[PDB]
Amino acid sequence: AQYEDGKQYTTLEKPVAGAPQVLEFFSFFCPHCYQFEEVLHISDNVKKKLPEGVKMTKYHVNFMGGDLGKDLTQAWAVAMALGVEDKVTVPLFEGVQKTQTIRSASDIRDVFINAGIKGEEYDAAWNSFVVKSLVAQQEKAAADVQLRGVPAMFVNGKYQLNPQGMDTSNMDVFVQQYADTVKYLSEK
């Protein structure tokens, strides 16, 4: 078998029902997550290898960064509620890891302000029960698979990507193996 459990992916002991087709977990504090987003563009290359109907879901996690870690998960909920993931992902990553200018909830907000989101919209979304729910959903999804590491990707609540079984001498080969794997799992 060219794909085998334990190599390119692992299988969940207890599967999760009702999960999204493709589910990614990441942390703006997470060094490999910065690489998947800015250097390797994992999500985008996965997306391009799937049918157009497949739903990709990406969630932030709490277990890195203490207080800011949770602030970031609420802010990611704001980003999803407002639909501006594509406007704030890069500045969030660089604020936390490149310039290290994100050191409080107020600096996170600055990112959205600079990115074009009006102060009133941000604060209204930040404090909304819609966002509280989106925070709960992110947490719940993570809880379902006892997530202790990011970046992580799960396919149909049953399969987890195992980047440790993939060649890393070449960034492009590595993301294609990763993307081709997601496609193979999406079809099991």
Ligand X SMILES: COc1ccc(-c2oc3cc(-c4cccc(OC)c4)ccc3c2CC(=O)O)cc1
| CB nearer ligand X, residue 174 or residue 184 | 174
Name the helix (H) or strand (E) containing 88.
helix 85-93
Report how far apart the first and last C-alpha atoms of the chain are (Å, whole number): 13
Of the residues 113, 130, 143, 171, which one makes contact with ligand X according to CB under 6 A: 171
Is residue 50 classed exposed, middle or buried when 0-12, 13-18 and 19+ CB atoms within 10 A define those classes? middle
Nearest residue relative to ligand X (C-beta): 149
Residues in the chain: 188
| CB nearer ligand X, residue 39 or residue 136 | 39
Report the DSSP beta bridge partners of residue 23.
Answer: 57, 154
Which residue stretch of 14-22, 32-40, 52-60, 79-87 sits at the interface with ligand X (rule: CB under 6 A)?
Answer: 32-40
Of the residues 19, 22, 40, 102, which one makes contact with ligand X according to CB under 6 A: 40
Residue 44 is given by DSSP the state H
Cα angle at 51 between 136 and 154, to 5 degrees? 40
Which residue stretch of 14-22, 110-118, 131-139, 166-174 sits at the interface with ligand X (rule: CB under 6 A)?
Answer: 166-174
Q: Residue 161 Cβ, how far from ligand X at the closest point, in Å? A: 8
Q: Residue 151 Cβ, how far from ligand X at the closest point, in Å? A: 5
Of the residues 94, 174, 183, 186, which one makes contact with ligand X according to CB under 6 A: 174
Confirm or reject binding of residue 143 to ligand X (CB under 6 A): no
| CB nearer ligand X, residue 36 or residue 122 | 36
Dist CA 140 CA 142 (whole Å): 5
Q: Are 28 and 93 in contact (CB under 8 A)?
A: yes
Q: Are 55 and 22 in contact (CB under 8 A)?
A: yes
Residue 172: name the closest of 58, 43, 56, 39 by CA.
Answer: 39
Confirm or reject binding of residue 168 to ligand X (CB under 6 A): yes
Q: Residue 59 Cβ, how far from ligand X at the closest point, in Å? A: 14
Q: Which residues make up the interface to ligand X (CB under 6 A)?
A: 32, 35, 39-40, 149-152, 163-164, 168, 171, 174
